[PDB]
Design a protein around this ligand. Structure first.
Ligand SMILES: [Mg+2]
Ligand SMILES: [Mg+2]
Ligand SMILES: [Mg+2]
Ligand SMILES: [Mg+2]
Lengths: 66, 72, 110, 93
RNA sequence: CGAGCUGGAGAUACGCUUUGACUCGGGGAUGUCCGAAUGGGGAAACCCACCUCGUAAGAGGUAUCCGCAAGGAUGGGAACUCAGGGAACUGAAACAUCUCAGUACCUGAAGGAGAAGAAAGAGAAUUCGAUUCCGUUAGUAGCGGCGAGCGAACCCGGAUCAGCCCAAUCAAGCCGAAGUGGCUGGAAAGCUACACCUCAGAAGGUGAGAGUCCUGUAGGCGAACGAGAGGUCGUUGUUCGUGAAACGAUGACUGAAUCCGCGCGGACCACCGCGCAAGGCUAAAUACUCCCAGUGACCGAUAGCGCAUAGUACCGUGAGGG
RNA sequence: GUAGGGGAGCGUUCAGUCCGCGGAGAAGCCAUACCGGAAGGAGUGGUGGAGCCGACUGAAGUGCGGAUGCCGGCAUGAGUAACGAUAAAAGAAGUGAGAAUCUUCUUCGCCGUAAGGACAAGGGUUCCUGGGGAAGGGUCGUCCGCCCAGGGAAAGUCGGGACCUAAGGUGAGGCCGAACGGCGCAGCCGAUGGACAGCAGGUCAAGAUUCCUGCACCGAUCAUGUGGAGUGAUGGAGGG
């Protein structure tokens, strides 16, 4: 979610995690359009989640290739 | 604009009446005070490679003696 | 417009505490803090009770009625209580909880 | 990527009756061109697009408050699929 | 930092938080598209390409001017600085020299300042010892249709102070002393009776007027790691308007001496005296106020900025006005 | 006693000092027959609802009836002129709190090279639906081009770009210029011109050479077969 249990993943295993959230985020976007969003907090959570993956994939790119 | 030493800078043209005599007639009253400009000329000379640059008169002289950084 | 800045967005108490209403109507009256608003300087204690007229239209049944509820205050209640009466705060320490500064008085219990 | 682009489906009484003939309408990114829009639907829904038509849509409101208002700005893509139609369960709606 | 938070937004829902939210410091990583705008085009924010890597997604590259390259430059700044260019109304109770004024404006270059600076000097003591700035000299000396009017410098007193190289503590923040009873009153910090702190009685808040109720004040503590040449003609500068007009500067034409040499000392000559041009660099005092803080016999809603916030509504094709 | 000169003072804000006052009621407002030689100043009551007289000294953005003065509010003219083409209207039925004015039916009248219909420019959601009824509507509205919410706009072939050039614009290099800049061959930009493939119908409440149905056409890439060898620029010519 946030500490060291996030960086264990390989190359395509990072792009995979993003894609699964973007898809969920879109299913929620469609849910919003048809008056079905009972859990709006889920929206920001996934956006915070995708941000974290994208931030870390840049940390590890510099904590190796310098 | 002479390549060696930039130029064209100039000033005013006074033109008095009672003009010249025995040191003192009454004096020499002015009737003018305008504002004018002064310029030079040009030729083709070079250095390093090929150039055709604008050249002053007191620059054509300074070159027809000893060449300064740029030849003929 | 200004507001609750006069203090320091710093309340002299917590949302857990029992506090005594010093000043106004409801003098000395004691009660558990239920809501603390530092910036607005607001306190919700089981003390100041008011009757709130409920303006209710088609909003899930008409039933436009009256309601019994608590109305929030400022710094018109003193910084916690122990010798029965209102107090200040002075002797800081740390028990088994090192990561905590406590609040004392002319005694030492909160 | 795929999952972005198609923001929301088009609600309305006309889109729901267009659904009933295997024609799906979406509010997509105004910059997301016909080919990119074709690909994104194709992947995310697992169906082939036999035809695509789209068009940009303006905004402009205010109820009260001297806040003169301002636009919103969309693009609406409408696709037709080959004989074996349907999209998910989000078609029967 | 120590329980709240979920921007103004005052509004419901979902939620997040002592396995330390929120906010405050300080660094990162993202950062579409336009704009010097920089691939090419363009009626800003849009249109159209090529190259290279790449799994498609996607990532990087493609302006010109300096220089081997490294690396620099374009654009933006309220005012202040220097430079190129440079008015008129106006004053002279008319006007043309003169004045307004090298002001206003345009343009260029640059910085937190700049400029200027290390005597071919000031000036008459064989004194001084780079520059700028302030006082003063002094409305003096002088200029001037000798009219309107313009107007130095040396000496001395201060701010600051040096001359050097070439060419042959401050923000995040924490700690912080001491009042209770009666009364008036919707409400007490007012009134009253006793009391207390003071290195703190600056001030803000709190139902009214607060040393002792809150935030604070004096005092102290406080950081990961973040700041600190001569000549002639033409002209001009300074008090310098052709004047007896030297000296500087320079567009045209000429064009020297080399230390028993050269420049200056207000035509010029002698004598006496002060200096070493034709190469460069340079802190500090000085100017300004977009921004920040503190203060005020400053304003308090026709005042004060144009605005208790708007360059908006509104006017105009536009500059612009509001 | 006008210009003018001289003298003594009243009042306002701010300041310093003293003396006080105030939620058992400050300033400000309102009324008043009291006082003082004037400017002025008190008492009382009423209103207000939190500040403030008095005295001494200091300082000023310090006293208004005028300026076709400035800002604002409100009067007069006056229930007056008008209500924007002399192309009419009538009745019935409906709706509604309310109807000359909205809807529906039947007549009537006016335009008909237009006062019908289709673009372009320009405007920007005014379009359709449901609802509204404060202001806007020269009257009234139950209605609207107004107010609120939702929806609607579909292109290989139509117009523009990924094609072309005109005037003009710009323009590496190149020609001039106190600066800023002014020109300028090729090239590039620039339609109002050239070029180029889709016709007939159907139908949302609101789109149609765009969607649907019927049958076409154009270019590109590839697969198949025939062909059995050429293809034919940045250049020439014809053609446009
Ligand atoms: Mg007022
Ligand atoms: Mg402004
Ligand atoms: Mg008047
Ligand atoms: Mg041309």
């Amino acid at each position: 979610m946030k500490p060291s249990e996030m960086r264990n993943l390989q190359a395509t295993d990072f792009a995979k995690e993003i894609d699964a959230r973007k898809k969920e985020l879109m299913e929620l976007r469609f849910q919003a359009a048809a008056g079905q969003l009972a859990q709006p907090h889920r929206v920001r959570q996934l956006r915070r989640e995708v941000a974290q993956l994208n931030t870390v994939k840049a940390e590890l790119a510099r904590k190796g290739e310098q | 604009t002479g390549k060696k030493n930039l130029v064209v800078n100039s000033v005013i043209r006074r033109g008095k009446a009672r003009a010249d005599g025995g040191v003192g007639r009454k004096t020499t009253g002015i009737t003018k005070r305008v504002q004018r400009a002064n310029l030079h000329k040009k030729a083709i000379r070079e250095n390093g490679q090929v150039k055709t640059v604008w050249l002053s008169a007191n620059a054509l002289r300074t070159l027809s003696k000893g060449p300064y950084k740029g030849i003929e | 417009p200004s507001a609750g800045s006069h203090h320091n967005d710093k309340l002299h108490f917590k949302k857990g505490d029992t506090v005594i209403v010093l000043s106004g109507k409801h003098k000395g009256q004691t009660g558990k803090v239920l809501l603390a608003l530092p910036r607005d300087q607001k306190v919700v204690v089981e003390g100041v009770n008011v009757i709130t007229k409920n303006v209710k239209p088609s909003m899930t049944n008409p039933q436009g009625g009256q309601e019994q509820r608590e109305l929030a205050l400022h710094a018109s209640k003193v910084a916690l209580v122990d010798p029965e009466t209102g107090k200040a705060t002075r002797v800081r320490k740390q028990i088994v909880d090192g990561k905590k500064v406590r609040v004392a008085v002319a005694s030492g219990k909160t | 990527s795929h999952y972005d682009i198609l923001q929301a489906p088009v609600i309305s009484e006309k889109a729901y009756s267009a659904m009933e003939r295997g024609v799906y309408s979406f509010w997509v990114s105004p910059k997301a061109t016909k080919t990119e829009i074709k690909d994104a639907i194709q992947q995310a829904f697992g169906v082939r697009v036999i035809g695509i038509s789209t068009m940009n849509v303006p905004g402009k409101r205010k109820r009260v408050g001297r806040f003169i208002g301002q636009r919103n700005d969309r693009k609406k893509a409408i696709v037709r699929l080959a004989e074996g139609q349907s999209i998910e369960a989000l078609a029967g709606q």
